[PDB]
Each structure stands twice: as C-alpha cells, then as structure tokens.
C-alpha cells in the first residue's frame, strides 16, 4: 500500500491506498496509444481513377500514333488523374481490453503516488467559482503553477474556477483517464473522486 498525503482544514492527513506496486510502461503506452487513436477523425480522402471527373474515352488510338498507349485521363499516370492508394475515410478506433485500460489507470495514478505528486483534498475552502478563488486556494495547497496539475473533482464550481489556468487540466472522475494523468506533473483529487476512482479499478 502507498501512503497518500491528504489535505484538510482539520490538518495534514495521511491515508493508506491500494495502488499496484509494479508499473508497466508498455501497458501505459498501449492505453495512451488507444486513447489518441480512437479520437482520430479519419477524414482524409482522395479520388480513385473511377471517382474522377473525366470520361472513359480512349484519348487516342492504341496503335500507330507514335505516342505511348493510353486509355482515359483519369488514370493515375496522368497529371490530374486519380490517386492510386490514397486515404479513404477510416475508423482508427479499437476495443482495447477493459482489464488493460483499468490496469493502466490504476498504474498511472500509482506513478504519481510513488513520486510524491499525488495530493488528495478534503474540499476547496473559498473557491466557489472564480479563478482568483481557486488560485488563492492553490497557494495554500502548495500549487504555485510551477507544475502542471490534473484536477479531478465532481464539484463543477471548482472545475470552472481552475479550468482557464494554463497549468491545470479539468476532469470529472468519470473522465479520469491515463493520458491526462501522464500529461500532467501532479494529480489532485476530491475524496469523492478518489472513491470513484477506487470503484472503477475494482
């Protein structure tokens, strides 16, 4: 078990948590790959020599002109003809195994835990919507903006307050994902979100 520092008005707490011990870099890479692959738009397209505007007339006779034999000017050997193996619209998504993405999620959170960069918060004192409020809170909480932070919390007023900062990413715990965990240098969570995370890896 790791020991995760907790932040309370009632004082600097500690709490044991059951993150996995051994971390698999290749596995985390497989989840990030699959994350960034299934979001692809797949909108690259080209025109086959049959999808092109020209007519299928034979531009000149097969024999006895002294020029190369050609068919129609849609053939890809012509400028302005079709393109042989151009992109067609594609679905890059795939069903990465549920167990694997669950494992990576717990793994990526454990890496921040094993580093000292996982803070669990009780609540957010004054922050009720405004950036200046969350900023002030961040100063008390040791978050000065020198490091990037993944804020994971179901409180929307806290999410809107932090989200425009250039060093803060914003998530509801149902949106916890490993790519955003790895993007960031620190990880900050509600005890409400922490409970949610703990349920999703079980």
């Amino acid at each position: 078990v790791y020991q995760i520092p907790v932040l309370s008005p009632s004082g600097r707490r500690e709490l044991a948590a059951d993150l996995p011990a051994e971390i698999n870099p290749h596995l985390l890479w497989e989840v990030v790959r699959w994350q960034l692959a299934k979001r692809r738009r797949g909108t690259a397209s080209t025109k086959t020599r049959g999808e092109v505007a020209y007519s299928g007339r034979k531009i000149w006779p097969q024999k006895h002109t002294g020029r190369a034999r050609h068919g129609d000017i849609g053939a890809p050997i012509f400028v302005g003809g079709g393109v042989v193996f151009g992109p067609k619209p594609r679905d890059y998504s795939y069903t990465l195994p549920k167990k694997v993405r669950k494992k990576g999620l717990a793994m990526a959170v454990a890496d921040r835990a094993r580093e000292g960069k996982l803070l669990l918060v009780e609540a957010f004192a004054g922050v009720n919507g405004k950036t200046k409020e969350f900023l002030a809170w961040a100063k008390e909480a040791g978050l000065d903006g020198s490091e990037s932070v993944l804020l994971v919390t179901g409180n929307e007023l806290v999410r809107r307050a932090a989200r425009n900062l250039p060093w803060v990413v914003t998530l509801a715990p149902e949106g916890l994902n490993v790519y955003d965990i790895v993007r960031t240098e620190r990880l900050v969570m509600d005890l409400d979100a922490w409970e949610v995370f703990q349920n999703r890896i079980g």
Partner: protein
C-alpha cells in the same frame, strides 16, 4: 512518468516492409516478385489453396462421404455437450446447467451430460445424462446424480 517516457517495448511495433523503393533496400525494381509470369501481375494467380494448373485438383479427386442433408435443412434435435467431473470440482452443494453455463463450461442451448474424466465430488448434480463411469464414480463418492428432462 512523463509523456516522453511512454515507449513500446522492443519489438512491440516493428516497421513495415516497403518494396519497389530502390536498389539499396533489397526490394527495388521487381518488388520481390521476380520476373514475368502470372503472380508477378497485379491480381495474378488463381487461388493456390485449390487450383493446380488445370489438372483435377487434389480435393476434387477424393470421394464424398456422409449425409450432407437436403432442404429444408438441418433436423432440429436435442443436443448434448458433455462436461467432465474434473470441471465440477470447483463447485459446492448443488450443480446445475444454469450454474454450469455461467462458469463458462457449458454452452447455452445444449443439454447437459456429465462425463467421467477426473474424480467425483459429493455433489447433487442435475444433468440431462451421464456416462456409465460418470454415474458410478459419482454415486460412489457421496455424489447425488439427478437425471431430468
């Protein structure tokens, strides 16, 4: 662990074989197809799993055998999938086709039949059929067979 640390394990993502791309590569000019003939062609070659240059094929000179059937097709009948005693050891108390399908052992829509590889545990097991050695082993280890339909 930073984004720039995420790399695939050695060999996880090998690069492709790109032919017809110069002398240095080993694959220039003919793109490993050799020279002329069918099969060098785009689209070339009939399906080599079957075709044999025009002679009667290895498959087609073999004789047919057995019932292939006829329209209106398959005759619907009760189907038995057998499950071994060794597969039952994990359970306690009573064993049922329901419980057996959720374990992953029995397939849906298949009447149960207990087979006798392995030993018998004292279990009341409700199955559509038993082998001879399934009944004997079972009803001799405290087991409780239950034929049904």
């Amino acid at each position: 662990m930073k984004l720039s640390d995420l790399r695939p394990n050695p060999g996880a993502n090998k690069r492709r074989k790109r032919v017809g791309r110069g002398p240095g590569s080993g694959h220039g000019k003919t793109a490993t197809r050799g020279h002329k003939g069918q099969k060098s062609r785009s689209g070339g070659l009939k399906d080599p799993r079957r075709f044999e240059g025009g002679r009667s094929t290895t498959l087609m000179r073999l004789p047919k055998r057995g019932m292939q059937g006829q329209v209106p097709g398959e005759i619907k009948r009760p189907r038995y999938q057998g499950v071994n005693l060794k597969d039952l050891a994990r359970f306690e108390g009573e064993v049922t086709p329901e419980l057996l399908v959720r374990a992953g052992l029995l397939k849906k829509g298949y009447r149960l039949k207990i087979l006798g590889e392995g030993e018998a545990k004292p279990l009341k097991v409700v199955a559509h059929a038993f082998s001879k050695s399934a009944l004997e082993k079972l009803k001799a280890a405290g087991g409780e067979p239950v034929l049904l339909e």
